[PDB]
């Protein structure tokens with residue numbers, strides 16, 4: 001079944017390679033890429049602050065394994081408990097601004113199939129809309 005690993009691997013290596021190149025996308029040294037769907041330039045949380053957002057998660061191949069923005073109902077996460085990719089992105093995503101981040105498998109759910117449809121060597125992407133921001137102290 002590792003055969004699939006190669007697909008996730010190639011599509012994924014191509015996904016990041018392609019995504020960083022895709023317009024609106026900004027790539028970082030960590031390999032994390034974010035695209036600003038809507039600029040808000042508002043507030044936003046630190047690694048320890050809490051955030052409120054809505055989002056849709058899918059595979060490089062379009063296999064949607066999770067969603068929330070579809071519902072449009074925000075979810076609360078602590079930047080410290082969120083996926084690594086998300087960890088930095090929220091801190092860079094201003095409130096009111098809607099971004100899309102493409103998280104390298106290393107910064108996402110792992111290089112292994114760590115999920116349902118999420119197969120071996122899967123790169124995951126999510127759409128992140130910032131509705132409200134908290135604060136640790």
Ligand SMILES: CO[C@H]1C[C@@H]2CC[C@@H](C)[C@@](O)(O2)C(=O)C(=O)N2CCCC[C@H]2C(=O)O[C@H]([C@H](C)C[C@@H]2CC[C@@H](O)[C@H](OC)C2)CC(=O)[C@H](C)/C=C(\C)[C@@H](O)[C@@H](OC)C(=O)[C@H](C)C[C@H](C)/C=C/C=C/C=C/1C
Nearest residue numbers: 055057065066077078081082083084086108109110114126
């Ligand atoms: C894992 O299983 C997932 C289930 C699915 C997997 C697929 C993804 C699409 C999703 O649907 O969650 C999903 O919505 C999701 O993961 N999201 C939503 C979008 C941003 C945050 C991200 C995510 O889960 O970040 C976080 C990320 C998944 C956790 C790990 C971060 C490090 C990274 O290396 C790991 O890779 C695997 C994943 C989890 C969160 O959503 C937010 C921030 C964290 C919580 C609310 C905390 O409750 C959680 O923090 C971990 C905790 O473990 C606390 C302490 C204790 C409680 C009882 C346990 C919660 C467990 C949550 C587990 C979750 C949701």
